[PDB]
Design a protein around this ligand. Structure first.
Ligand code: SAM
Ligand code: SAM
Lengths: 340, 324, 324, 340
């Protein structure tokens, strides 16, 4: 940067140009981008100046007051500013009514998925995500904690149904485009299962010697590197689809699992976890019986986790009277290697 | 940590988890001259060493085991069944709600059997773990050491945290390695988990060791609701906010089949009685897939009380001005 | 009671429950010149009267309702949604654990909207119901009367049971009809259900009205666990034994279908993209049957505290001798 | 009776020749028949004289003490004597390990079944019961409360799979054989769906005029009335299977429901409840989709009820740490009559 002073830590501190969470007095969430010298409207609850909240820690509640844009002070109406965690993104999507878009998943089910899958900073994980990238976001946050400068080398490889992946939720994530291209690889089902051969690729392009390519300039240099980026995309597919074995498989898709999971598991190393999320238990039941017949899978189990919060007021403790149903199910098992 | 990373081949000296059955998972250190025994047969280590992790191992009159790389989930399943430990439904929820990551600096008391410890250590920047009981402390220290947790990101300290707080100073009984000019650890915790009989006695000591410039998250783990009540009282007195208690309920289902028995077949048997005046999945019969709850459920583990604190509730005013 | 017995044909003057949808069930008294209205159409009573109970009734531009005989379960579903009433999962469990039957003589306080009252009255020898609020008392009395509960096996009494106990004397505000030489009802209750803010204030008054020669069962219905705690204290002081609190959790599932989407069909779409270089159950597609939880669950109604008492803990010694 | 004094009420009082429940200090149940001048062994917990507990109310705890048969006194080891309710019979069967015999049912599920089915003292209910009669016992107890002298006229009609019904649990019930034959009728699936015709019956037997039949004596009278009882059995089948409509259908069977329930429901009146108990939700899910297509069924619903007890000690309140899973599911709906 161009300031002599140390920058603000966006993981601990409200900072310019970050997407952050705002909790309203009605307790629903909003996502707000903090562009400098702009104002933010909370409708009924007033409006405020972005500049006036920068530099504070997350977790604070601010009061908007007037002497229409108001002034802010710490609450002695109001709002609370939070980091945009994987949990808060999920809650925001539920508040705005997108519960079917996220396949009815809950914080506790996704929390359990992360640990059943043994997700770690250095692992290379195979992933299907039909949610617009919410599952990929849970992974990345657990692996890297929002840290664009992380030295860890873990990767999420996303296999997807259409020509391009839908990972739009990552637009909220505060990861740089460089970080994302280094830790997230996308590849279609077709490229993954029927990849191009090297011969096929080279017969459309073979690089110039790098001395010659370096000496290119003008439109010829741009013309060539555009072909070279296509070449590298194809090369990456070769790397991802060869005899490369992955460290785990996590899935949140509504494709037919019994006919899909065994094919995906061919690329998973022995002893690694497989976790399939499903909104409906019957779906996973069918999968589990299928996997029972296949000795490459150890003891498939259907798990359920449900959270019930309490009204947490001293002298009036009881669980919440009503709440949302659902939250889905996990199928957990381990890839194993049968004996001859 | 032998829990961390991803091993390819089983090597002599490796700690493995040998899966015998769903309720029988044994920690076994590979040694070429040793033999692993099961109620179904004996499995020589020399016939395991050198094979890929995840290998099914077979012996004749066939019997089987699977040899797996240690994992916190699997390790937790391998511990003595009736014990006082945190299971994956609770701990995975706690880690997710407190947003655990390499950014996390955690304080855990007490260590107990180290079930939660291993799950923390996999994910977290550093773990500071405290144990009151000196025999338990020594066992956890030896085990964390053997597992490689101590030489990675875990510190354990022999301490009564309710009486003596959480500071780690040179001279204390601890595994902490002090750096140059370091006479005390700087814990700077942004995540706190208390599993203690009286967490309300430990909460006052946290102000000396938590981070001062970021949101700090706390979870207290208590079996009885009067314990929750005492915790809510003291959290409020010491300035903890956004306080909420929840319970987590986990269930597991078996995949089973029920025989399909038609009316027509029951009628035909009645008609024949009138004239005179199986193993599940058997292909001679029709079957319907069904889910069957585990025979025994964990209908309560503990109440989980969450709370948050920011110490320095302020900003650098003209550092924000100095950006324009 | 029009809730009791089994009617064949819908008659003018009958109270019916008209099922419009799962969350819309309306109590409607049949009258030949009246019309029932729905957001989908108008249903004249004269086109209903004379038809069998359970009839689907249709009008053109088609719309439908079903006309059912009142039942406590259905009546309970027809009451205002957010209200303070006992639902079938709690009440059916309470009646079963306390072993309700024509042998039961029950004491209920307070009456509230009479949800539990109707379920009691269907099964029980007699119901003695008490209501503190005079407007609520008058409404419940009028309704119980209209339903035929009062002329069957139900008594309601305007009473503060915490302050004035449970005795019913001539001169009291009550529906009780006193027999010859009767100046007080003999309640002789063997079943007690308390749904009150402070059931521990009512429990001391029970000794005057419960049966003395048989096991008497009690259930207290309280939303907060500190209320349960006060109840456990007073139950112990007044000699109630076999005390246990439980919660009941009910869930409802929809029968649904999820589209089956194969890998091969997703591949074929990717192949075609490469060349260029629905209503649930739709028969053009394959479907898998699935269960889907109701969107909103009742995750807490109240804690249920059960307790039992025997007053005369003795036998007739030589009446037992006089059998030989 | 032959005593001038009023008899003891077996519903309120421990009485001779009754089957009763005994709860041991280990909290498991036993069923004990109270034959006069006999003793009862509780193994480790000692033995006692039946005579010494007669005449007391249910619900009391007795101590066995010694000066091997002991003496009893009210507990100042021990046992508690209870009425044999439908709830206690179920619990006894679970304690002895017969949980699959009762199809994994719970107190709360059976309690809800009784009320969803609107079971009343005067109703005539169609019933299938694969449990040895536990469901029939729940019904009878709710309808009559154990009262052999009840004036109510309700009936349970049990349709069954084999030549004879298995209602052996009723051997514990303390109902007289007369009561049972007046309120319980049994008929096989075959007799119910393909009953004999009157012509078929009469062509094997037509009664003598009752003046002539009354005048029969000796072996001819016995020979004839045995044929007349067969005739009345057949006649009862005609009554149960004609255009008789029932007041409700309750089922606890593992027969195929989608292909069975619609046939049974033809004999149920409009507006009456149908309740099918199932150990497995997937079974009921299949049934519910089947019934959805059939306009004779109003809004089939799959319900679940689960009880979680608390450790109910003041100053240490929490739910039980472990307990048995299961408890099954109910499919509830109403028979209705479609419009033309
Ligand atoms: C239930 S265990 C912890 C289990 C652990 N969370 C796990 O998942 O394996 C409780 C532990 O807290 C320790 N403990 C109790 N009081 C303590 C105190 N005041 N300071 C430190 N540790 C304490 C006990 O010795 C015991 O080992
Ligand atoms: C929640 S309601 C009962 C609902 C009822 N159980 C049902 O299922 O519809 C509580 C009722 O208790 C009544 N109540 C409160 N205190 C009372 C007292 N001391 N004596 C009698 N009734 C009382 C209230 O007026 C209120 O109507």
């Amino acid at each position: 940067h161009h300031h002599s002073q140390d920058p603000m830590n966006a993981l601990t501190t409200i900072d310019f140009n970050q997407h952050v969470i705002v909790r309203l007095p009605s307790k629903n969430y909003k996502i707000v981008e903090l562009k400098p010298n702009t104002s933010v409207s909370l409708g009924k609850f007033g409006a405020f100046e972005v500049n006036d909240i920068i530099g504070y820690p997350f977790g604070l509640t601010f009061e908007i007051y007037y002497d229409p844009i108001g002034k802010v002070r710490l609450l002695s109406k109001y709002f609370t500013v939070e980091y945009l965690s994987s949990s808060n993104l999920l809650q925001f999507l539920i508040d705005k009514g997108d519960i079917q878009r996220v396949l009815d998943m809950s914080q506790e089910s996704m929390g359990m998925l992360l640990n059943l899958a043994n997700i770690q900073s250095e692992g290379n994980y195979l992933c299907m995500d039909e949610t617009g990238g919410l599952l990929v976001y849970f992974l990345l946050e657990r692996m890297f904690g929002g840290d664009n400068e992380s030295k860890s080398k873990g990767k999420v490889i996303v296999i997807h149904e259409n020509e391009h992946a839908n990972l739009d939720l990552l637009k909220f994530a505060n990861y740089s485009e460089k970080f994302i291209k280094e830790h997230v690889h996308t590849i279609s089902l077709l490229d993954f299962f029927e990849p191009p051969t090297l011969q096929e690729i080279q017969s459309r392009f073979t690089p110039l010697p790098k001395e010659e390519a370096r000496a290119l300039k003008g439109g010829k240099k741009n013309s060539y590197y555009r072909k070279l980026r296509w070449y590298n995309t194809q090369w990456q597919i070769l790397e991802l689809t060869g005899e490369f074995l992955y460290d785990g498989l996590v899935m949140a898709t509504t494709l037919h699992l019994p006919t899909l999971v065994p094919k995906l598991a061919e690329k998973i190393h022995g002893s690694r976890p497989i976790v399939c999320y499903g909104q409906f238990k019957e779906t996973l039941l069918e999968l589990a019986h299928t996997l029972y017949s296949d000795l490459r899978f150890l003891a498939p189990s259907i798990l359920e986790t449900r959270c019930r919060p309490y009204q947490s007021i001293r002298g009036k403790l009881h669980p919440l009277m009503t709440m949302k149903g659902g939250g889905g199910y996990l199928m957990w098992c381990h890839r194993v290697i049968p004996a001859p | 940590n032998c829990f961390s990373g991803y091993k390819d081949l089983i090597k002599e000296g490796d700690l493995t988890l040998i899966w015998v059955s769903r309720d029988n998972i044994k920690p076994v250190r590979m040694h070429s001259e040793e033999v692993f025994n099961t109620r179904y047969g004996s499995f020589p280590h020399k016939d395991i060493i050198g094979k890929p992790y995840g290998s099914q191992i077979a012996i004749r009159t066939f019997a089987f085991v699977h040899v797996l790389q240690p994992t916190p989930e699997l390790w937790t399943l391998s511990l003595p069944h009736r014990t006082q430990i945190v299971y994956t439904p609770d701990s995975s929820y706690i880690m997710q709600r407190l947003n655990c990551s390499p950014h996390s600096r955690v304080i855990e008391a007490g260590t107990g059997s180290g079930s939660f410890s291993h799950a923390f250590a996999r994910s977290v920047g550093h773990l500071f773990s405290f144990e009151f009981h000196h025999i338990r402390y020594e066992q956890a220290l030896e085990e964390f050491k053997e597992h490689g947790l101590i030489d990675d990101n875990v510190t354990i300290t022999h301490r009564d945290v309710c009486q003596g707080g959480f500071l780690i100073k040179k001279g204390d009984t601890t595994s902490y390695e002090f750096g140059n000019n370091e006479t005390a650890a700087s814990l700077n915790a942004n995540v706190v988990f208390l599993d203690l009989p009286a967490p309300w006695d430990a909460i006052p000591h946290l102000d000396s060791v938590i981070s001062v410039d970021e949101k700090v998250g706390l979870c207290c783990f208590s079996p009885c609701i009067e314990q929750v009540d005492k915790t809510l009282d003291v959290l409020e007195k010491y300035g903890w906010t956004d306080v909420e208690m929840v319970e987590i309920q986990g269930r597991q289902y078996e995949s089973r089949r029920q025989m399909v028995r038609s009316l027509n077949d029951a009628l035909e048997r009645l008609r024949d009685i009138k004239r005179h005046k199986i193993k599940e999945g058997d292909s001679n019969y029709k079957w319907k897939e069904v889910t069957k709850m585990e025979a025994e459920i964990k209908s309560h583990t503990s109440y989980l009380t969450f709370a948050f604190k920011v110490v320095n509730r302020s900003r650098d005013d003209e550092k924000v001005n100095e950006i324009l």
